Amino acid sequence: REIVHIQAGQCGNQIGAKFWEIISDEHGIDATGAYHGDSDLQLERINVYYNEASGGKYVPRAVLVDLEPGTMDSVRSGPFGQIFRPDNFVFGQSGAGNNWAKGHYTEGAELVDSVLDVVRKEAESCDCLQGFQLTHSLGGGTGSGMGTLLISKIREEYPDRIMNTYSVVPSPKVSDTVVEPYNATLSVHQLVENTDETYCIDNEALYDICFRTLKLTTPTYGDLNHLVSLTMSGVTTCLRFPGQLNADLRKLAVNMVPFPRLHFFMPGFAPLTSRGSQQYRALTVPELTQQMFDAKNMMAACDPRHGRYLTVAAIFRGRMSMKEVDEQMLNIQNKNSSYFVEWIPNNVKTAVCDIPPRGLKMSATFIGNSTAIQELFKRISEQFTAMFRRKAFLHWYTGEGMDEMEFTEAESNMNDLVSEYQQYQ
Amino acid sequence: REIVHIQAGQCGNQIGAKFWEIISDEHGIDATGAYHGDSDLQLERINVYYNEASGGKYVPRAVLVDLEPGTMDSVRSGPFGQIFRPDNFVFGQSGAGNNWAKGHYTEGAELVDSVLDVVRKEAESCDCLQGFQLTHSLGGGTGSGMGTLLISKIREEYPDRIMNTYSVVPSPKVSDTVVEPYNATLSVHQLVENTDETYCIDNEALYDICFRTLKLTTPTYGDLNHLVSLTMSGVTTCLRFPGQLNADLRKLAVNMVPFPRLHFFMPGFAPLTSRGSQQYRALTVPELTQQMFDAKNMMAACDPRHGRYLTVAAIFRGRMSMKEVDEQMLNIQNKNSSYFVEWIPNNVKTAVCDIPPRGLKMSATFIGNSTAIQELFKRISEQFTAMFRRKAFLHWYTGEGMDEMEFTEAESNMNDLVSEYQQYQ
Amino acid sequence: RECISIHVGQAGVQIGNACWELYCLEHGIQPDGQMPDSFNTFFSETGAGKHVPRAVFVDLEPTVVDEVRTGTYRQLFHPEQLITGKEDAANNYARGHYTIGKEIVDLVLDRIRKLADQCTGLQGFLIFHSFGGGTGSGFTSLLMERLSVDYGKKSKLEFAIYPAPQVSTAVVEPYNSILTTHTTLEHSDCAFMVDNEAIYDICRRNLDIERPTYTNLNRLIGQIVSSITASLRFDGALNVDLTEFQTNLVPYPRIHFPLVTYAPVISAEKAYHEQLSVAEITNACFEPANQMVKCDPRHGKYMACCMLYRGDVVPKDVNAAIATIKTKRTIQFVDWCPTGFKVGINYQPPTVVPGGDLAKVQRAVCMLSNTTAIAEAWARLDHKFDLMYAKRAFVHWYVGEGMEEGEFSEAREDLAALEKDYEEVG
Amino acid sequence: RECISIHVGQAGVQIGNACWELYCLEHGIQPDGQMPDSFNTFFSETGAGKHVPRAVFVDLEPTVVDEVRTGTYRQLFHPEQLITGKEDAANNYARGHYTIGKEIVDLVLDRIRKLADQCTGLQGFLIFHSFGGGTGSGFTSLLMERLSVDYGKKSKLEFAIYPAPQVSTAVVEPYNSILTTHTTLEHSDCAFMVDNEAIYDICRRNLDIERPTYTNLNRLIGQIVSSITASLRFDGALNVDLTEFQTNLVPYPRIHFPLVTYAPVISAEKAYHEQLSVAEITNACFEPANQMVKCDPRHGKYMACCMLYRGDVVPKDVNAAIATIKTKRTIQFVDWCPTGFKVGINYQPPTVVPGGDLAKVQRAVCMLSNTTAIAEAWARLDHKFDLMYAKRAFVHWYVGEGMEEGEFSEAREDLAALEKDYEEVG
Ligand SMILES: Nc1nc2c(ncn2[C@@H]2O[C@H](COP(=O)(O)OP(=O)(O)OP(=O)(O)O)[C@@H](O)[C@H]2O)c(=O)[nH]1
Ligand SMILES: Nc1nc2c(ncn2[C@@H]2O[C@H](COP(=O)(O)OP(=O)(O)OP(=O)(O)O)[C@@H](O)[C@H]2O)c(=O)[nH]1
Ligand SMILES: Nc1nc2c(ncn2[C@@H]2O[C@H](COP(=O)(O)OP(=O)(O)O)[C@@H](O)[C@H]2O)c(=O)[nH]1
Ligand SMILES: Nc1nc2c(ncn2[C@@H]2O[C@H](COP(=O)(O)OP(=O)(O)O)[C@@H](O)[C@H]2O)c(=O)[nH]1
Ligand SMILES: [Mg+2]
Ligand SMILES: [Mg+2]
């Protein structure tokens, strides 16, 4: 069981660059592809992400995609830049100009053939794979433009493999581009059918977590990409290391999704403590579970207290005990009996692994499927509402062949999605 | 089982100069005819190409032919120039001026006697020979004009010995001479009946392989002649070194040619890797097999995807395993069942040798007899029609004694070959 | 007299891991299979100084089996006995029974036949599995269906783990634990039910251990299995055989779900102060605070019970201790059972495993009673399954894998009928 | 009692190379021919401390035989026993039978008569060759044609390598492997068919070898030939001779194609755990997973079979083990074969070659069944030949060498009748 990696645009590449810095140190490899580890459990499942090479070297199964050559220049020269194979870097020369229309129809259609030739090469080399990881953002043009195109083309060829996309959805309070609502609405139109499991993150909330819980006075894009990676790495720790009770990517999908369209998730991580307040803290499971369910710690700008949890999960790492995980989970359900659906008994999925993150004793990851997402999509639909009334900025997109009908479907399908979550709330 | 060598024209000598530079280093022979090797297997069949001299020196079975003395001065003074015997350099004083009429009738007639006395002298020196190697191009006058005259005279004397031609057939996109199409068509009229098997190579494609796969920014005739040499060196490696399973020139000829007229081949070599991307590559048979069949690597300017393979070959070099070669060959046939002829099962020939190329662990050579050549001859034929229709440049050739009949059958006979390959497609 | 044990899934393999360390200590057989008799019941001898078990390890995922392959007990197991897959059933019964089932079910059925060829007097099989996941439920249900046709009248025993009503670990558990009932109902000669949360209470109070993890629970099950088969492996005052045990215990063909409990379990330091005699260990077996499934016998009426003593026991008092119990009206028996005790006294004292959580004793008791108290452990579950199935939640996963929508009707209809039979006899 | 072996082609020499190293180990004879008895069956002694084999090496290409001339075993043979040509047949049967073969066929026949003069009790000749190339087929078919007329009634055995239906390395294989059918049919007393595919699966599964190359496959065949003749070279409880073995096996003159299999082949580490007894080894021989040709006996009915045990075997149980097999309806025999077994027990254990892929064992079995299932190994192939012959591909190469276009009529006609007989008797 091994998984290939796809990154798109400036947003994804900056997120994806931190991933290979963190997971590489986890498996003990140097910056030049060499190995110098100690524990044998590192080599047991090294191949879930890497490919072997001559001379005892490893290279990752990553693809970096772009429509401008600037960002590849940064990642190539940066730390851990020589790990990647040169053939994997796929980039154009023109750019997107924050156009969803240019990315899908005009510019990306020429460059789409090149990448599928590469992902086909990585798909044959792997013996028995399960999923693809996609990293992108929903504001710009390249990430939402080609990111939508590959997903449709990837899905058709492989309708039996699981698909993962780790999306970043825009927020009004940190709004940055005049044409954001046009991009975000058009892309989610096809994520409602062409992906299996979807994560949503906000730059607004990642600012809420960074100042208050971390006591960060200078949150740059260095640290935010740090936080998303640790949630990204935690989900697939059952694959790379053993455990008392196991859960791979396929188990979670069946356990959380009651109906095919309700697969928009909310991350959360614990512990997250400041550099000075760590000495004054305990080391126990009950402190972890309270932090996980805290409405003050989620990674989306939506409060769960306006809705009820459908299903949740908890991924624990370290030497722990099975009852204590069991007793904490029942405490929350009984104390918070108002905030959980009634007609699904025992809504919590559990998993414990063995190897803790280096320098720590315990950890936890929360993936909780709630009905509070319906607000995070209505807010966007409102910003899109006042623009399409007067056809502002419409001429830029209409030049590449779209029509007023397509924008009509963009609102209608977004209308359908919010309706479904309200009905089951 | 030892073989003599014939070179014609400026193209052949520049091709042939590299072959003796490469093959001498393979056998350990120095630049002055001495020997300084280590493995005894070099000396087991050293005689396959060289002839013994007094004092412990070696000289090759080479014959250099020319109609202008400029090129002979360069090869004589170049690296590995003193290896040849001085009597072998045969060259005239007038030149051809890109006239196929002059190459056969006026200028080659006087000089044809001189060379045949030399090739006879090597034919008496041989104990039990099998073949003749001829290296030339189909664009100029000397190479096609003399080369077709050499083959015609050589064939009649030796109706049973095997004859090899490694031709370079012109391409429209790298067109260099105004009267190329007259030259190419008139020569191919007689390669149909006076040679045993023919290798076709395009200067257009060798640019494609040099820029793209090799990441070469300045492909000069220094590097293109490097590529062709490795194919000629690879075909006859079964004769010079041992192996688990063997294949000499006679085995390939019977295994490739279903009907006498369908004997035009397309080579291909693997691996071919840049100096920077080699560190990030595996070393296995399965990578070698896919590269050979890649339509982006086949060394002629015609697409095999436009037709179906009749038969193929594969000469492998290195210490390998026999089922691994067998298992991959069935993988390609099963996965690509659309691109192979149906009424001949198991269309693949195999051979494995023991001595690998110096500084390398593995290698492979691909010889594929396809029906896709029928297009590579139509493109040339079209260039001819727009010329002979209005009798442009015709007066230059008619002055030496050809007639409109000879040009009339030139298209008529080359019409037949396109008919055969399409019939069995 | 030999038996074959089959471990399926993570739960089965983990329990099977605990057992085979227990058996080796009993017979003085080192992890590398060499002995520094009676061992033929589970072991096969190979030439000189080599014993290998009659066990087969089964899984659809390599992770929980390759832990055995590298561990301390790599040398004991014959390499062909460890069967692994490539993709787990992902908590789908439908994937286990239908899609991912048949590409592996054939290999083990070929491997069982090889093991059943060496034996001469095959007694029966022991099956270890759980009702949680589809890998241990969907596949194990398939194995018993193929075993029954090939062998027929030979007795098969299982040791299943029932999901708890409150302390449960998954979301879709009720869907699995209802679909296994048909193949257990129609294809099992004896079925043992054990609950995970109940073993926690026994660990908390009696053993006074703060944090029982899955190591210690699996050690407890090893003690129950070892005692039931101790009648074959050794010799004593009275003997009870497996086919003998079914005759006295199971009153009707459809009613084969005994409840198990053990005595004594005690900590090392508190073992000094108490004197453990036959008079009380027969009373400890009947405490509702020591039943291994969260059910109250006070709302049920006993139909039979078996008491297997081992160590230093004399039949003079056992009849007296059994006589004492009969005089209580709190412990109720049915009217059509004038006598309901089957007794077996053995000579070999139970052996304590080093590194364990139990103290060395001179005598031990294992109880196996067939009561109607267990009727509730199914009625509560059927509410959970029916409540979720009202909205057809999660069903889309199962429908696409080969099932149809009426299949869940038979799952509830069968449990509808089976609860009535316990009501009728009660 | 002496026997003579002839090797043809690259396949024959490579197979013969492995065997003659194997024999030297058996009789304690160093590569330089000196021994630090019974060896007269294969060896000739010259004066004092010099033994040379009764071998002859034949090829039309100097490359492969020169490897023998330089290798570690240069000193064993006469210089004159190693015969090489100058131009190979280039995978042409027509060149082998008519053009290139005739210039060398005389030289070896003069050499055969020289070796046959030394012997006093010649039983027959052993031929190792393959149906792939014309050098190994066209020359061999000519070579037996000369042997049969000159010598008449003495028995000749062949050990052929049949072309696989899927995993093959040449383009024109079917043309050769049909034209050889006539000469083997009417000029061979017994023919052994061995396939290159099946030996791979045996190496993969049973031996657990990752990358089997031609070194290991040839070592497997060396064991089969060693076992058949161990009845002559040693002494035991019961004896079966070549003339004795042909009598019991071949029921009709036209049905002489036994299928071979061997037991046991086991890896070194997996050998420790299993106890290899005669009861199971006689069962392993009948597993269709261990037949040496990609053929299913399940679609055929056995005609006879011969067992060749060696090591520590007593006749008390062999009849018991043979009785066990007869009770299976899976393993089917023809109605006019109430008894279908020939048994020979020897006293010498098989000897393991250092550097090989087998472990030292006390017992070994060789099975030789004349079954009717082998009809399919020709029926599938005749489709390949006939499909290609539809368009008359490649025929121009063979026609120019002296053959006629009608010559291919008899090749498919002869296989038409030979396949007809098996369904008739079946
Ligand atoms: N006693 C015990 N119970 C376990 C253990 N592991 C899991 N369980 C129980 O098993 C239930 C979940 O289903 P599982 O038995 O784990 O299914 P599985 O073992 O994953 O089988 P597969 O899905 O095929 O891998 C939970 O309710 C646990 O109580 C264990 O190691 N020991
Ligand atoms: N067992 C075994 N089979 C071989 C070996 N080499 C080749 N073969 C088989 O031979 C077939 C091809 O025909 P060959 O027997 O090789 O013809 P040849 O050995 O070259 O004989 P000549 O053509 O006279 O030189 C292939 O299909 C292989 O199965 C070997 O070393 N060992
Ligand atoms: N989390 C995170 N978000 C980023 C980063 N850089 C840009 N973004 C977000 O990405 C959105 C715009 O996406 P964009 O960069 O235009 O995508 P592109 O056109 O494909 O490069 C903005 O709303 C930013 O908030 C980063 O380093 N980290
Ligand atoms: N591969 C290769 N082709 C060459 C070289 N030099 C010339 N040619 C080709 O030869 C063709 C003309 O043939 P030419 O050599 O001039 O014939 P000539 O009259 O004997 O000199 C041109 O189309 C060139 O592309 C060389 O060094 N290598
Ligand atoms: Mg599992
Ligand atoms: Mg050969």
Numbering used by the authors:
A (entry chain 3D), B (entry chain 4D): 2 to 426
C (entry chain 3C), D (entry chain 4C): 2 to 37, 47 to 436
Q: What text comes from the article?
A:
Many protein filaments function through dynamic cycles of assembly and disassembly, characteristically using energy released through inbuilt nucleotide hydrolysis activity to perform work by pushing and pulling other molecules around. These dynamic filaments have been termed cytomotive, to distinguish them among the wider class of cytoskeletal filaments that perform organizing functions (itself a subset of all filament-forming proteins).
Here, using cryo–electron microscopy (cryo-EM), we solved solution-state structures of recombinant Drosophila melanogaster tubulin heterodimers, purified in both guanosine diphosphate (GDP)– and guanosine triphosphate (GTP)–bound states, in addition to a structure of MTs polymerized from the same material. (C) Cryo-EM study of Dm MTs prepared with GTP.
